[PDB]
Amino acid sequence: SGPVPSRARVYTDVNTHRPREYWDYESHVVEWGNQDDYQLVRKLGRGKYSEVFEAINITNNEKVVVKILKPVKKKKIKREIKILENLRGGPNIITLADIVKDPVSRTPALVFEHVNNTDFKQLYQTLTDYDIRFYMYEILKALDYCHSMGIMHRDVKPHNVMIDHEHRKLRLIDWGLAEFYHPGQEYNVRVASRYFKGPELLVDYQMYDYSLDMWSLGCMLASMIFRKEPFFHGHDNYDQLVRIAKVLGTEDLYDYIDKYNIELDPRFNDILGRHSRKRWERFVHSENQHLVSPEALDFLDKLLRYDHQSRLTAREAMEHPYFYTVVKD
Ligand SMILES: Nc1nnc(-c2ccc(C(=O)O)cc2)s1
């Protein structure tokens, strides 16, 4: 008595009908640029997987970002490179400008375009209703494109969305966890940041798809219109799903479990408890009302759903009324 298999309802076989070389990244033969064309300048980020630096291309005085890949299996590096290459030129997709064998760990190093980024903890406090609609629309173009190209980002979150506010410029970065969708494949549920993780990942349902990114996006939309970052703030993976059940309610949650016949950890039993589904208006107050609207609540409602097969796709989302001031302009 195991889980019921699932399939993306859209773009289900895009990779199945593309030449093997498109998704068989392990056979990809990298063509290298010259590492002497770049001068690192300042370190910006240090995470468990990379060292990111603001840098300068000395053949044109253009700023760029260099991500040196700490040693970590040639498969992971090839996956990201192949994906970045497949998506290059996509709408709002960060541009991979060069790839070089970096002597700083003989490791490779990816050279990305620079985005004069206003940091997410300070910007969100200053955005307007129209600004959020606009940027949500831009993020959607990137996801529908990447999904339409058989690729799940799997790490959608505010750090992974660069915004050069003064130029109304948006870029979706860090495709390090991104993967190719092949119908019926069981993936690694340990992706995405805790606060943006979808129900499927939290109950250990592996045959997920593109709709994972839609949940992450819904969590971002919620944080922005209500001005609460992160919106579902759990202590750990178990508590995270509890944070979601307190808002969406346990009823629907158990209806999801039943439909896919997912055996829940017996430790989830006592801590999920029993909660009623709350109204989005309960989170509306005087510091966030000007960013909230029926369209918004309705659009958010259609993103944050337990069943991944019921969430709106990126294309459907762009058709939402929430975006006409935007799509009209
Ligand atoms: N200021 C910045 N401009 N681009 C940045 C950037 C782009 C991509 C990645 C990645 O890991 O893919 C990391 C940082 S950071």
mmCIF file of C-alpha atoms and ligand atoms in Angstrom:
data_model
loop_
_atom_site.group_PDB
_atom_site.id
_atom_site.type_symbol
_atom_site.label_atom_id
_atom_site.label_comp_id
_atom_site.label_asym_id
_atom_site.label_seq_id
_atom_site.Cartn_x
_atom_site.Cartn_y
_atom_site.Cartn_z
ATOM 1 C CA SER A 1 0.000 0.000 0.000
ATOM 2 C CA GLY A 2 2.231 2.806 -1.288
ATOM 3 C CA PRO A 3 1.719 6.377 -2.605
ATOM 4 C CA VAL A 4 -0.322 7.122 -5.705
ATOM 5 C CA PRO A 5 1.907 8.277 -8.606
ATOM 6 C CA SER A 6 1.461 11.799 -10.006
ATOM 7 C CA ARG A 7 2.318 13.726 -13.190
ATOM 8 C CA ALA A 8 2.707 17.401 -14.003
ATOM 9 C CA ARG A 9 -0.601 18.354 -15.682
ATOM 10 C CA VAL A 10 1.203 20.766 -18.046
ATOM 11 C CA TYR A 11 4.522 20.480 -19.893
ATOM 12 C CA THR A 12 4.495 16.795 -18.891
ATOM 13 C CA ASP A 13 6.696 15.513 -21.719
ATOM 14 C CA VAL A 14 8.736 18.462 -22.899
ATOM 15 C CA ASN A 15 12.038 16.677 -22.182
ATOM 16 C CA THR A 16 10.807 13.339 -23.556
ATOM 17 C CA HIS A 17 10.556 14.796 -27.048
ATOM 18 C CA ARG A 18 13.761 16.888 -27.086
ATOM 19 C CA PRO A 19 17.085 15.427 -28.271
ATOM 20 C CA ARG A 20 18.906 13.433 -25.585
ATOM 21 C CA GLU A 21 21.662 16.077 -25.398
ATOM 22 C CA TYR A 22 19.129 18.598 -24.034
ATOM 23 C CA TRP A 23 18.612 16.866 -20.672
ATOM 24 C CA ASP A 24 21.533 14.380 -20.581
ATOM 25 C CA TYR A 25 23.757 16.963 -18.873
ATOM 26 C CA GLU A 26 26.262 14.361 -17.661
ATOM 27 C CA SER A 27 27.422 13.918 -21.276
ATOM 28 C CA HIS A 28 27.647 17.693 -21.786
ATOM 29 C CA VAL A 29 31.095 18.824 -22.899
ATOM 30 C CA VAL A 30 31.918 22.223 -21.395
ATOM 31 C CA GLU A 31 33.591 24.856 -23.531
ATOM 32 C CA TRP A 32 35.688 27.131 -21.311
ATOM 33 C CA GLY A 33 36.255 30.868 -21.217
ATOM 34 C CA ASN A 34 39.442 32.503 -19.916
ATOM 35 C CA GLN A 35 39.823 32.948 -16.184
ATOM 36 C CA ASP A 36 42.366 35.759 -16.640
ATOM 37 C CA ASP A 37 39.600 38.021 -17.996
ATOM 38 C CA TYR A 38 38.270 38.381 -14.415
ATOM 39 C CA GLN A 39 39.413 40.126 -11.244
ATOM 40 C CA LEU A 40 37.378 39.230 -8.118
ATOM 41 C CA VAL A 41 36.702 42.343 -5.983
ATOM 42 C CA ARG A 42 34.598 41.640 -2.889
ATOM 43 C CA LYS A 43 33.013 38.518 -1.417
ATOM 44 C CA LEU A 44 29.237 38.826 -1.139
ATOM 45 C CA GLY A 45 27.896 35.450 -0.090
ATOM 46 C CA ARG A 46 29.124 32.384 1.771
ATOM 47 C CA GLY A 47 26.901 29.340 1.927
ATOM 48 C CA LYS A 48 27.476 25.604 2.398
ATOM 49 C CA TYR A 49 27.942 25.209 -1.379
ATOM 50 C CA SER A 50 29.637 28.263 -2.930
ATOM 51 C CA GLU A 51 31.678 31.432 -2.531
ATOM 52 C CA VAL A 52 30.170 34.287 -4.515
ATOM 53 C CA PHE A 53 32.104 37.402 -5.504
ATOM 54 C CA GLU A 54 31.420 40.718 -7.175
ATOM 55 C CA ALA A 55 34.055 40.882 -9.921
ATOM 56 C CA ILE A 56 35.229 42.932 -12.878
ATOM 57 C CA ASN A 57 35.848 41.802 -16.459
ATOM 58 C CA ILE A 58 39.055 43.657 -17.275
ATOM 59 C CA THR A 59 38.581 43.619 -21.070
ATOM 60 C CA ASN A 60 35.648 46.054 -20.834
ATOM 61 C CA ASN A 61 35.395 47.263 -17.210
ATOM 62 C CA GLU A 62 31.957 45.519 -16.886
ATOM 63 C CA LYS A 63 30.924 44.274 -13.405
ATOM 64 C CA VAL A 64 30.003 40.592 -13.078
ATOM 65 C CA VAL A 65 29.396 38.020 -10.329
ATOM 66 C CA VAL A 66 31.644 34.997 -9.947
ATOM 67 C CA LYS A 67 30.432 31.843 -8.269
ATOM 68 C CA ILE A 68 33.304 29.484 -7.535
ATOM 69 C CA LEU A 69 32.033 25.947 -7.128
ATOM 70 C CA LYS A 70 33.636 24.335 -4.069
ATOM 71 C CA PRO A 71 34.516 20.714 -4.904
ATOM 72 C CA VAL A 72 31.208 18.822 -5.158
ATOM 73 C CA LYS A 73 30.782 15.996 -7.742
ATOM 74 C CA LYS A 74 31.005 16.807 -11.459
ATOM 75 C CA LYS A 75 27.306 15.884 -11.830
ATOM 76 C CA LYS A 76 25.971 18.850 -9.824
ATOM 77 C CA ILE A 77 28.168 21.353 -11.693
ATOM 78 C CA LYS A 78 27.172 19.964 -15.083
ATOM 79 C CA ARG A 79 23.484 19.973 -14.198
ATOM 80 C CA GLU A 80 23.509 23.660 -13.311
ATOM 81 C CA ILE A 81 25.624 24.651 -16.304
ATOM 82 C CA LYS A 82 23.470 22.676 -18.745
ATOM 83 C CA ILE A 83 20.323 24.193 -17.253
ATOM 84 C CA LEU A 84 21.683 27.736 -17.256
ATOM 85 C CA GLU A 85 22.644 27.241 -20.908
ATOM 86 C CA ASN A 86 19.250 25.840 -21.866
ATOM 87 C CA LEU A 87 17.512 28.846 -20.244
ATOM 88 C CA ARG A 88 19.874 31.583 -21.420
ATOM 89 C CA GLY A 89 17.874 34.417 -22.950
ATOM 90 C CA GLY A 90 14.761 33.375 -21.073
ATOM 91 C CA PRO A 91 12.638 36.189 -19.684
ATOM 92 C CA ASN A 92 14.153 37.447 -16.434
ATOM 93 C CA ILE A 93 16.457 34.430 -16.154
ATOM 94 C CA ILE A 94 19.896 35.344 -14.788
ATOM 95 C CA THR A 95 22.381 35.278 -17.669
ATOM 96 C CA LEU A 96 25.347 32.892 -17.453
ATOM 97 C CA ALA A 97 28.005 34.996 -19.203
ATOM 98 C CA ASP A 98 31.049 32.720 -18.991
ATOM 99 C CA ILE A 99 32.399 29.472 -17.483
ATOM 100 C CA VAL A 100 36.052 29.149 -16.434
ATOM 101 C CA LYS A 101 38.327 26.656 -14.615
ATOM 102 C CA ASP A 102 39.025 28.722 -11.521
ATOM 103 C CA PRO A 103 42.489 28.227 -9.977
ATOM 104 C CA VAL A 104 41.099 29.239 -6.558
ATOM 105 C CA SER A 105 40.203 25.504 -6.036
ATOM 106 C CA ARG A 106 40.906 24.289 -9.608
ATOM 107 C CA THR A 107 37.163 24.107 -9.465
ATOM 108 C CA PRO A 108 35.107 25.699 -12.211
ATOM 109 C CA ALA A 109 33.614 29.145 -11.642
ATOM 110 C CA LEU A 110 30.482 30.519 -13.273
ATOM 111 C CA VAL A 111 30.469 34.142 -14.370
ATOM 112 C CA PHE A 112 27.027 35.769 -14.166
ATOM 113 C CA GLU A 113 25.724 39.191 -15.113
ATOM 114 C CA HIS A 114 25.729 41.736 -12.269
ATOM 115 C CA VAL A 115 22.433 42.993 -10.923
ATOM 116 C CA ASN A 116 22.555 46.245 -8.917
ATOM 117 C CA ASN A 117 20.456 44.576 -6.224
ATOM 118 C CA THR A 118 18.476 46.428 -3.541
ATOM 119 C CA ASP A 119 18.565 43.854 -0.684
ATOM 120 C CA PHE A 120 15.191 42.157 -0.073
ATOM 121 C CA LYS A 121 14.986 42.994 3.649
ATOM 122 C CA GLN A 122 14.959 46.743 2.926
ATOM 123 C CA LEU A 123 13.080 46.926 -0.403
ATOM 124 C CA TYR A 124 9.893 44.990 0.442
ATOM 125 C CA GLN A 125 9.263 47.653 3.105
ATOM 126 C CA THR A 126 9.059 50.305 0.340
ATOM 127 C CA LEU A 127 7.168 48.605 -2.535
ATOM 128 C CA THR A 128 3.730 49.701 -3.714
ATOM 129 C CA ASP A 129 0.702 47.605 -4.698
ATOM 130 C CA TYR A 130 1.565 48.109 -8.366
ATOM 131 C CA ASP A 131 5.232 47.255 -7.727
ATOM 132 C CA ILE A 132 4.327 43.863 -6.277
ATOM 133 C CA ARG A 133 1.901 43.090 -9.108
ATOM 134 C CA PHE A 134 4.609 44.008 -11.610
ATOM 135 C CA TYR A 135 7.345 41.909 -9.994
ATOM 136 C CA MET A 136 5.023 38.957 -9.384
ATOM 137 C CA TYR A 137 4.267 39.127 -13.095
ATOM 138 C CA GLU A 138 7.964 39.183 -13.962
ATOM 139 C CA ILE A 139 8.730 36.215 -11.702
ATOM 140 C CA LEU A 140 5.883 34.324 -13.427
ATOM 141 C CA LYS A 141 7.380 34.851 -16.890
ATOM 142 C CA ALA A 142 10.618 33.227 -15.723
ATOM 143 C CA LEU A 143 8.853 30.220 -14.201
ATOM 144 C CA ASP A 144 6.502 29.590 -17.113
ATOM 145 C CA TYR A 145 9.532 29.779 -19.380
ATOM 146 C CA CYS A 146 11.718 27.477 -17.300
ATOM 147 C CA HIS A 147 8.766 25.082 -16.805
ATOM 148 C CA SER A 148 7.936 25.233 -20.537
ATOM 149 C CA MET A 149 11.562 24.122 -21.017
ATOM 150 C CA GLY A 150 11.201 21.075 -18.751
ATOM 151 C CA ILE A 151 12.953 22.539 -15.706
ATOM 152 C CA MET A 152 11.920 22.997 -12.041
ATOM 153 C CA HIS A 153 13.852 25.660 -10.099
ATOM 154 C CA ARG A 154 13.130 24.098 -6.702
ATOM 155 C CA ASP A 155 14.610 26.984 -4.698
ATOM 156 C CA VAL A 156 12.288 29.941 -5.298
ATOM 157 C CA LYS A 157 12.648 32.445 -2.434
ATOM 158 C CA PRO A 158 13.467 36.141 -1.902
ATOM 159 C CA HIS A 159 17.273 35.616 -1.947
ATOM 160 C CA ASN A 160 16.927 33.859 -5.248
ATOM 161 C CA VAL A 161 15.138 36.789 -6.876
ATOM 162 C CA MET A 162 17.464 39.725 -7.634
ATOM 163 C CA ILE A 163 15.822 43.138 -8.017
ATOM 164 C CA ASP A 164 17.462 46.328 -9.286
ATOM 165 C CA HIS A 165 14.453 48.381 -8.256
ATOM 166 C CA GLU A 166 15.448 51.688 -9.864
ATOM 167 C CA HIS A 167 15.633 50.010 -13.304
ATOM 168 C CA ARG A 168 12.546 47.829 -12.615
ATOM 169 C CA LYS A 169 14.954 44.911 -13.270
ATOM 170 C CA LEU A 170 14.317 41.337 -12.057
ATOM 171 C CA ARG A 171 16.446 38.210 -12.239
ATOM 172 C CA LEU A 172 15.814 34.713 -10.914
ATOM 173 C CA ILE A 173 19.115 33.250 -9.756
ATOM 174 C CA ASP A 174 20.809 30.223 -8.232
ATOM 175 C CA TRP A 175 19.738 27.298 -10.326
ATOM 176 C CA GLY A 176 21.908 25.050 -8.206
ATOM 177 C CA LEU A 177 18.980 22.934 -7.040
ATOM 178 C CA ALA A 178 17.147 23.012 -10.369
ATOM 179 C CA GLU A 179 16.295 19.753 -12.124
ATOM 180 C CA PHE A 180 14.859 18.342 -15.344
ATOM 181 C CA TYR A 181 11.281 17.033 -15.116
ATOM 182 C CA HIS A 182 10.712 13.526 -16.485
ATOM 183 C CA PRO A 183 7.209 12.163 -15.811
ATOM 184 C CA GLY A 184 7.160 9.558 -13.076
ATOM 185 C CA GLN A 185 10.552 10.268 -11.542
ATOM 186 C CA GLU A 186 10.913 10.233 -7.753
ATOM 187 C CA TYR A 187 12.918 13.302 -6.729
ATOM 188 C CA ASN A 188 14.851 14.456 -3.662
ATOM 189 C CA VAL A 189 12.381 16.135 -1.320
ATOM 190 C CA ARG A 190 15.241 17.882 0.493
ATOM 191 C CA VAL A 191 15.253 20.988 -1.715
ATOM 192 C CA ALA A 192 14.065 24.587 -1.263
ATOM 193 C CA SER A 193 14.376 26.620 1.947
ATOM 194 C CA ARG A 194 12.264 25.480 4.905
ATOM 195 C CA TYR A 195 9.896 28.459 4.723
ATOM 196 C CA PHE A 196 9.175 27.965 1.038
ATOM 197 C CA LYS A 197 8.973 24.164 1.030
ATOM 198 C CA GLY A 198 5.706 22.762 -0.256
ATOM 199 C CA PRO A 199 3.459 20.190 1.404
ATOM 200 C CA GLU A 200 4.661 17.480 -0.988
ATOM 201 C CA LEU A 201 8.264 17.935 0.210
ATOM 202 C CA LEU A 202 7.200 18.041 3.874
ATOM 203 C CA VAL A 203 5.217 14.746 3.808
ATOM 204 C CA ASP A 204 7.962 13.126 1.756
ATOM 205 C CA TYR A 205 6.069 12.745 -1.548
ATOM 206 C CA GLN A 206 8.757 12.358 -4.222
ATOM 207 C CA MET A 207 6.908 12.253 -7.523
ATOM 208 C CA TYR A 208 6.405 16.028 -7.508
ATOM 209 C CA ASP A 209 6.760 18.542 -10.376
ATOM 210 C CA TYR A 210 6.799 22.206 -11.510
ATOM 211 C CA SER A 211 3.962 23.039 -9.142
ATOM 212 C CA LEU A 212 6.501 23.026 -6.324
ATOM 213 C CA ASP A 213 7.688 26.440 -7.531
ATOM 214 C CA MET A 214 4.109 27.713 -7.459
ATOM 215 C CA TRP A 215 3.866 27.036 -3.738
ATOM 216 C CA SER A 216 7.146 28.790 -3.068
ATOM 217 C CA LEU A 217 5.862 31.737 -5.095
ATOM 218 C CA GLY A 218 2.626 31.798 -3.139
ATOM 219 C CA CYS A 219 4.627 32.016 0.080
ATOM 220 C CA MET A 220 6.477 35.017 -1.385
ATOM 221 C CA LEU A 221 3.280 36.689 -2.524
ATOM 222 C CA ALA A 222 1.868 36.269 0.995
ATOM 223 C CA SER A 223 4.963 37.745 2.641
ATOM 224 C CA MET A 224 4.842 40.763 0.336
ATOM 225 C CA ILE A 225 1.161 41.684 0.513
ATOM 226 C CA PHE A 226 0.924 41.048 4.277
ATOM 227 C CA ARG A 227 4.468 42.214 4.995
ATOM 228 C CA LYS A 228 5.468 39.209 7.140
ATOM 229 C CA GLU A 229 8.755 37.517 6.206
ATOM 230 C CA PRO A 230 8.755 34.626 6.110
ATOM 231 C CA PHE A 231 4.979 34.052 6.113
ATOM 232 C CA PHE A 232 4.950 30.443 7.408
ATOM 233 C CA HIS A 233 7.756 30.601 10.034
ATOM 234 C CA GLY A 234 8.321 27.061 11.352
ATOM 235 C CA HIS A 235 11.067 25.882 13.743
ATOM 236 C CA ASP A 236 11.838 22.803 11.583
ATOM 237 C CA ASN A 237 10.382 20.659 8.765
ATOM 238 C CA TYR A 238 7.655 19.175 11.016
ATOM 239 C CA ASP A 239 6.752 22.515 12.535
ATOM 240 C CA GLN A 240 6.760 24.095 9.087
ATOM 241 C CA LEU A 241 3.860 21.915 7.936
ATOM 242 C CA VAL A 242 2.159 22.753 11.239
ATOM 243 C CA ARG A 243 2.516 26.456 10.423
ATOM 244 C CA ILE A 244 0.699 25.748 7.142
ATOM 245 C CA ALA A 245 -2.076 23.621 8.699
ATOM 246 C CA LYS A 246 -2.903 26.378 11.190
ATOM 247 C CA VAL A 247 -3.675 28.653 8.268
ATOM 248 C CA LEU A 248 -5.066 26.289 5.619
ATOM 249 C CA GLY A 249 -6.567 23.904 8.191
ATOM 250 C CA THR A 250 -6.077 20.196 8.832
ATOM 251 C CA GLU A 251 -9.217 19.046 6.926
ATOM 252 C CA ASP A 252 -7.843 19.754 3.459
ATOM 253 C CA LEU A 253 -4.442 18.531 4.646
ATOM 254 C CA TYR A 254 -5.829 15.080 5.469
ATOM 255 C CA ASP A 255 -7.812 15.020 2.216
ATOM 256 C CA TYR A 256 -4.433 15.385 0.407
ATOM 257 C CA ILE A 257 -2.853 12.547 2.387
ATOM 258 C CA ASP A 258 -5.821 10.285 1.553
ATOM 259 C CA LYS A 259 -5.817 11.063 -2.162
ATOM 260 C CA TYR A 260 -2.167 10.136 -2.638
ATOM 261 C CA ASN A 261 -2.206 7.437 0.055
ATOM 262 C CA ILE A 262 0.775 8.963 1.830
ATOM 263 C CA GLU A 263 1.775 7.244 5.057
ATOM 264 C CA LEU A 264 2.373 10.032 7.559
ATOM 265 C CA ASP A 265 5.095 9.777 10.169
ATOM 266 C CA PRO A 266 3.444 8.815 13.457
ATOM 267 C CA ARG A 267 5.263 11.783 15.038
ATOM 268 C CA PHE A 268 3.221 14.161 12.814
ATOM 269 C CA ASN A 269 0.091 12.809 14.514
ATOM 270 C CA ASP A 270 0.147 14.701 17.833
ATOM 271 C CA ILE A 271 1.698 17.948 16.615
ATOM 272 C CA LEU A 272 -0.563 18.617 13.615
ATOM 273 C CA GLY A 273 -3.548 18.586 15.949
ATOM 274 C CA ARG A 274 -6.796 20.049 14.658
ATOM 275 C CA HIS A 275 -7.172 23.452 13.024
ATOM 276 C CA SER A 276 -9.893 25.218 11.077
ATOM 277 C CA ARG A 277 -9.048 26.905 7.767
ATOM 278 C CA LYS A 278 -8.585 30.649 8.444
ATOM 279 C CA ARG A 279 -9.663 33.587 6.281
ATOM 280 C CA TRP A 280 -6.862 35.565 4.555
ATOM 281 C CA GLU A 281 -8.519 38.723 5.871
ATOM 282 C CA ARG A 282 -7.410 37.761 9.399
ATOM 283 C CA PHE A 283 -3.877 38.693 8.349
ATOM 284 C CA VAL A 284 -4.936 42.053 6.933
ATOM 285 C CA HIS A 285 -4.112 45.011 9.163
ATOM 286 C CA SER A 286 -3.312 48.710 8.805
ATOM 287 C CA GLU A 287 0.322 48.413 7.694
ATOM 288 C CA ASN A 288 -0.524 46.028 4.839
ATOM 289 C CA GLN A 289 -4.107 46.799 3.701
ATOM 290 C CA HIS A 290 -2.894 49.047 0.861
ATOM 291 C CA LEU A 291 -1.224 46.050 -0.814
ATOM 292 C CA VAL A 292 -4.223 43.759 -0.318
ATOM 293 C CA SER A 293 -7.253 43.310 -2.570
ATOM 294 C CA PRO A 294 -9.946 40.780 -3.482
ATOM 295 C CA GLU A 295 -7.978 39.964 -6.642
ATOM 296 C CA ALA A 296 -4.866 39.380 -4.523
ATOM 297 C CA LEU A 297 -6.546 37.183 -1.910
ATOM 298 C CA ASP A 298 -8.225 35.208 -4.693
ATOM 299 C CA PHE A 299 -4.925 34.866 -6.581
ATOM 300 C CA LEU A 300 -3.097 33.849 -3.408
ATOM 301 C CA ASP A 301 -5.880 31.389 -2.579
ATOM 302 C CA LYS A 302 -5.297 29.635 -5.901
ATOM 303 C CA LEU A 303 -1.544 29.337 -5.340
ATOM 304 C CA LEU A 304 -1.448 27.969 -1.772
ATOM 305 C CA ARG A 305 -3.240 24.636 -2.070
ATOM 306 C CA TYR A 306 -2.119 21.324 -0.559
ATOM 307 C CA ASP A 307 -2.784 19.367 -3.739
ATOM 308 C CA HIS A 308 -0.061 20.270 -6.211
ATOM 309 C CA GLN A 309 -2.352 19.184 -9.054
ATOM 310 C CA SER A 310 -4.749 21.979 -8.109
ATOM 311 C CA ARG A 311 -2.396 24.939 -7.806
ATOM 312 C CA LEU A 312 -2.438 27.427 -10.673
ATOM 313 C CA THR A 313 0.281 26.980 -13.266
ATOM 314 C CA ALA A 314 2.518 29.908 -14.115
ATOM 315 C CA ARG A 315 0.642 30.514 -17.392
ATOM 316 C CA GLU A 316 -2.775 30.421 -15.684
ATOM 317 C CA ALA A 317 -1.507 32.810 -12.998
ATOM 318 C CA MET A 318 -0.473 35.419 -15.581
ATOM 319 C CA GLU A 319 -4.094 35.404 -16.775
ATOM 320 C CA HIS A 320 -5.338 36.447 -13.340
ATOM 321 C CA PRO A 321 -7.234 39.773 -12.941
ATOM 322 C CA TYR A 322 -4.674 40.752 -10.294
ATOM 323 C CA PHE A 323 -2.413 41.668 -13.231
ATOM 324 C CA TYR A 324 -4.402 43.869 -15.583
ATOM 325 C CA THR A 325 -3.001 47.251 -14.520
ATOM 326 C CA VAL A 326 0.227 45.455 -15.389
ATOM 327 C CA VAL A 327 -0.669 43.556 -18.584
ATOM 328 C CA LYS A 328 -2.610 46.605 -19.805
ATOM 329 C CA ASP A 329 0.471 48.825 -19.467
HETATM 330 N N1 LIG B 1 24.454 41.375 -7.200
HETATM 331 C C1 LIG B 1 24.267 40.152 -8.003
HETATM 332 N N2 LIG B 1 24.092 39.920 -9.350
HETATM 333 N N3 LIG B 1 23.973 38.605 -9.683
HETATM 334 C C2 LIG B 1 24.047 37.730 -8.650
HETATM 335 C C3 LIG B 1 23.992 36.335 -8.688
HETATM 336 C C4 LIG B 1 23.577 35.664 -9.854
HETATM 337 C C5 LIG B 1 23.523 34.254 -9.871
HETATM 338 C C6 LIG B 1 23.905 33.521 -8.725
HETATM 339 C C7 LIG B 1 23.822 32.049 -8.763
HETATM 340 O O1 LIG B 1 24.254 31.401 -7.803
HETATM 341 O O2 LIG B 1 23.294 31.508 -9.750
HETATM 342 C C8 LIG B 1 24.359 34.193 -7.557
HETATM 343 C C9 LIG B 1 24.410 35.601 -7.544
HETATM 344 S S1 LIG B 1 24.261 38.656 -7.196
#
